[model samples]
Target chain A: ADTIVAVELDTYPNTDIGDPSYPHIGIDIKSVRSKKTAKWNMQNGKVGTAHIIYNSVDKRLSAVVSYPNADSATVSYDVDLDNVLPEWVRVGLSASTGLYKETNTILSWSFTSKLKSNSTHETNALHFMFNQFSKDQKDLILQGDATTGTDGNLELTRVSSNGSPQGSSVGRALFYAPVHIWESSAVVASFEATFTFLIKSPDSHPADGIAFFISNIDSSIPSGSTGRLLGLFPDAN
Target chain B: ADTIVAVELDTYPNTDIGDPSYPHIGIDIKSVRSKKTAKWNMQNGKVGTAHIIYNSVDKRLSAVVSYPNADSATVSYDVDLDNVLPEWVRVGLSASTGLYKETNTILSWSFTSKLKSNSTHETNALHFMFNQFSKDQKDLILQGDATTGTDGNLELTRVSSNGSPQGSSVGRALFYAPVHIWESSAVVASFEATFTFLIKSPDSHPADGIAFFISNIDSSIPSGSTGRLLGLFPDAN
Candidate 1:
């Protein structure tokens, strides 16, 4: 009754630098040398909270969140999800930003992952998938206005040409669909993640964003929202 | 008691095109006629979704999401934020890929503005103040690996000395707290933004970390994780 193993931390392994191209699963921590790695502990918000739990014993869930001080944090996970999700599933996280002679040092992070396995009504009902890429195929560094739509995705705002609204859009509701279950809890065994997001960029230089939890259910799992909002998929025409 | 704006005909500013420096919002139903700006509306992934209630008062709010297959998208917005936030807020967005239109997109983008005013207290809060500029600051682009650490803040990861990892660490946590009551649920608003972080060659992109939101609840919002873990800020930091 314990198998836990659903993780993803691709954080950006396009290749190069010690040659780490996302081999699938590997994280280095729990060693604590006090290199000091745990940035932005709080204030801008979103710390922790997750519900809907149930596993049929595949067990492989891991945890080690320290963000409050600076003793040394660790994150390394492997994913092998099961609870009847098969459109496409890929969750592998590996973290280590601790190597600072003191190079600007700013590691702000946010996380929240929940991929149901206890079932309530059709897998608890929470499916998100969206894909888009540009900025020369994948640069994706934007704060507010870089604009790109038409399937390429990358438009914090401003669109037309069939997209809609030559004007207006700022209500706000960036994301919330990591698949949350709240009724039949008890399928436990293979996944656990919670980082909570709210880094900070109140206007002017110094900002970053990225968060993921992709699942096509069975085959396609690598969704790309670039600047963020890369979720909500299903449009291959 | 009726404030709801819905948009979804291709999200991400409708293919994304204009950039008078950094001007993007979202919505472009195919230029509406464009020979010279007849309001365009292309079609690539055209999107639309709506669900608003949480106290509903509607002062301004706003909407305009578009995408037309891929060339470019546009955007524009006004804020009401329902005074500040009456009850519910859940903004999970998407966009990316552009830099004179080559592709790669520069880590593209990363957006999340989730807010659930306060259903007692579960998770949901945000207050963003955005800005980014670099035509000389070396094109202004920094990211963290481990999956989106610094798209912009945490003080660019504070890298001194040679200062290339992207450098910059003053207040860290993406410069300043954006504004969040995410956990307690009671928002305050005063926002403005701008975006453009397109800098490349961190040695072909090493992990590309940046984008944060880790909190202990404001020790002062500058925890410093180093390089991209400073990974920058916004969205959860």
Candidate 2:
């Protein structure tokens, strides 16, 4: 028996909350504009969804959507590959029109789930994707109390400045922070993902090009290259 | 030439200025107590005169040597390679401090000769004895100012008061801001250096390992991972 699992994201007009201290994040439908929904496969299900909202002033499309049954769900958005979404996205609570934008990107995430009673085995999977990140966008993301990654127990220490003073690299990582994937539902599946981005050295050292990878054993799994690729939370000795 | 080079340093009983308001970085010698001259060779003819200074209070051996002829001098302290000295050898100005003490370490090194002008293909080198960085000394080096390794430019930044934010990964690619490779003889040399540090990840991670390398190309090398040996910067997507 085949079942049609449909997922629809409704779009709204760009409400210019111009410089409001706090702004809303949801689509404010002045006239209930419906978009062609991307269907979801219930059984053969890849529980995920995506949508775009063009911000006329910025000449960019800001995307905002949600994944259902999120308790055990993992969703992603590709900024440049499959689609050309805006360079930035904000995840927040409710709508906003103030200094504080509604959606704040979570610098890190971690989760754990309990096994089903008498459940023999469980297969689960989780993957993350981040594309088209530039210097400015990264700075904005880290402006507040959020940072893409973290050091060990030691407080953040600056080794040098003069250039890119933070002495850290800016790019997406396997688990930018500590994220957990536990028994969501009663199943577990193998996880896989592909990441793409342009890594430019502040200096002209092409040898400074970076790499990426994955490891379940260590959340701090870092690339072989130190500094840019795996400086803060990695083990690249 | 089998030439042996050595220098001696002394400290006045209580005049030893403790670590400082921030960290021990730039500390002026109360006085050049006595001159204990030694001999050193510029193997590959790149090295010049070198010297060492001992601070009895901290029981650490510090150095401010020069190779004015080669335009490549290094200012580093000697400590047990088995500990922080092996990897986390702090070499810069201190910006943070506690009641314990505050001092910033600055390594002022310059090349007397124009580096990168070695057309002779000669192998010029500078050597520091392992015994000099003895096993029992405290790594009396200063913390750095920069944060990220390869973000935008290679420049230093200021420190912040916040400890580790929940999700942010701190001090990944701690980098040294790019500085003019000053020369006493007004010469430049094609040079590369590997800065290694001891790292420890408190949780399920290494102690924040890191690796630093110099390139003839882009001075802003891209580092992987985040805080530790990730290089000189931090980034997340």
Candidate 3:
């Protein structure tokens, strides 16, 4: 349970653990003591955005947070995942509010991976099928209101939590990594994906539908994207 | 245009082409000459079903036709695909009736392949996305009324050729070969398939739907399968 590779926008400086005195951003692996960090002085009443990136090939993990009026702060560290983490890892975010509680809430979040294989031969065709969820469920990443349910599949919708309406709930689950697609601009690879699902809606009308989509690794969910838009875009395309 | 690998159920004994005197099933590669021929005496007034199997690994193509109240006949031959065919190929069936046109109607048909990669490394992940169809379209296979249209995509529905209703027409085309799926039974492999399509239904209501499906190489469309059933099964499962 202690195996962790994380990037944190830390506020409190716990001097006992050798933390910097000021607010900072850090890349930590398995310990509160950051492997690499940078001093960050966030201005009050300003919105900040953080982007964390990890290059599986280079073993470099980085975090860059930018505020509207100030220069962005960045912290990065290199760690070999083959030795540090297990094959399957859960991905999420959690924050600890100190003795003096402050209003801290995330506005938006996204994660993408361009995980390439290290074999001599490239992939000509690839595929997977899920009759049900795995016992551990670590090979998949879930975000927002998504969760592993007793219904024997990954449930992307959960009822009202934090006073949000059930119909307004949004969730997502992605394969741990991205696959190799095309070798050239014009020439595309060939592959197939087939799945079966059962949506048990007690109501006569099912409000929203599930979707299968593919996007680039550098892409992320748009800001202020709605549940109706499937979090791929905002009010405008 | 002439590169062809076919399993022919030749009825007429074309003496000029060195065909056998009796009705036979033959494996033909780029020529009318039979590479491996077997005498097939199909029972009259009975439903005869033919199954064609290709093992890309062994370079063997076989056809077995079975009929009630009679023994089944089989014809097979080995030909390396690397030497016999191109990278992309169109798959379908064609027949030529002689001066005496016989009532030769296929009750059911199916083709399957377990295409394996020859590389030292197997595929870890494989994917392909199609925004539109290609000029040649040898990469995709369409079955039962599926065709290439001017709209820049695969049109799975075509108008009836004969006096049959427009909704009854069926066409299909396939990718040249298949891909390796699973090495073991319990340990299923991982993979995905993504596609984009525009279904322009002129009517206020669309009649049927499209589907993405996967089955074993030994499986094919069931007998008496309807368009509403997506041709996967007959009245039974």
Candidate 4:
């Protein structure tokens, strides 16, 4: 029963002077067993002191960003942990600006965990938020439209006129981890998790919707699932 | 190292059926040793599920109130724990309607504490929030501009037209017990706390600002301290 995880980045450069084309600052948390990721980030130009806090009991993740003249703003999100949960997770920061021209560094950072004292509960009930994947967590198990980039970021699907029905896209990212929360013998075992995700379309006319799902079908996608439902069910067509 | 203290209130009535002239619901937390108080409240007419969370490590306190029509708002406060902290604290709810005509009852309430493990760290780094004094924590140490009602609610000051400082009011609520976070010996210790509070005046043109302070002076107000300084130091006339 580990309830708290806090990370503070006090000094982040505000300039993208030597930064590469797409520079960003982020916290990437990945489950060691499932390799599932929950990422959070703020692109260049908004650098400042950022505080990230994760409370496991409530499955809430809140972040606060503050700059010199600006008052701080905090945003919170709930991570869905209905799917299988991993026993161990890795937490770290990820940033890149193509290669040479731009450079960004984290001046100071600290991470601390306040663990729960209940002896009956096993440790490592992973709940995290990520923005990008690390080298080791980039294992892609693609089925249908789901895919992963070399940087470990997930791209569920791409708009394609090559679709079977011509002009549509659908995909799913199902983690390989086994959510065995009930597997424990504790009298009261609860599941709470949180993650940060972004869904964007190139244009205003986005056709389908994105969904967060947890299903019995573990590492494989059902045969006919696609489109509007975000591949959660069989293709109605 | 108890990082989290959560309180959930299930039922709250929107109407003050038997309530007096002005009614409100609140949660009051007070340190038994210092008599320091941190109170939170919401006025009548908006009632539903409410959640309060206090995290000690980061010293952050937040409250979320949800109404029937999907109207929700969250407020957060940073509690000042600079002075020595009390080892044990008392927590409960408080409500009032001017007189015997009003009444408020909580249908159900639950409290949970995410206790800190790692025996190396000392316990009882109290993180609490309160609105009214419980029976055991009613020891009020009044100084200049401070007073309390019969119901144990603090009234820092009342409007005054006295000649010394005519047509304005100033106040300070000083707790009797010293913070004494940990007066005993321990291998390693840390202090952090947070509470929710409100600074209000009768109208939009209220004079002076409010301040949260922790200082060496206990149960005594510095001479001549008044106005924007909030009684922390001697007023520099």
DockQ of predictions, in order shown: 0.01, 0.01, 0.07, 0.01
Interface RMSD of 1: 16.1
Single out the weakest 10-residue window by summed lDDT for candidate 4 chain A.
A94-103
Predicted candidate 3: what Cα RMSD to the true structure?
Answer: 22.0
Q: What is the DockQ of candidate 2?
A: 0.01
Residue B31, candidate 4: Cα error in Å is: 24
Worst 10 residues of 1 chain A by lDDT: A97-106
List runs of model 4 lying over 4 Å from the truth: A1-237, B1-122, B125-138, B150-152, B160-168, B182-203, B217-219, B235-237
Model 2 chain A worst lDDT run, 10 consecutive residues: A93-102
User: What local distance difference test score does each model get?
Assistant: 0.25, 0.21, 0.45, 0.32
Window of ten residues with lowest summed lDDT in model 1 chain B = B95-104
Model 2 agreement with the true structure over A87-146: per-residue lDDT tens digits = 111211111111111111122221111112113332211122222122222111131122
Model 3 lDDT per residue over A183-204, tens place: 3322333222233223333333
What DockQ number belongs to candidate 4?
A: 0.01
Model 4 agreement with the true structure over B65-179: per-residue lDDT tens digits: 5545675545555553322334332233221111011112222232333323244232322222233322222223445544443243344444233311112344544332223
> Which regions of candidate 3 are displaced past 4 Å?
A1-211, A214-237, B118-237
How well is each residue in A1-237 modelled by candidate 1, as lDDT tens digits?
111122222222323222143221222111111112222222222232211122334343343433343432343333234443432233211111111100011111233333333322112122121222223311122222233333433343333455332212111112222222122244323323343322222222211222223232222212332211112212211
Candidate 2 A-chain TM-score? 0.24
Q: Residue A65: error of model 4 in Å?
A: 53
lDDT of model 1, residue A41: 27
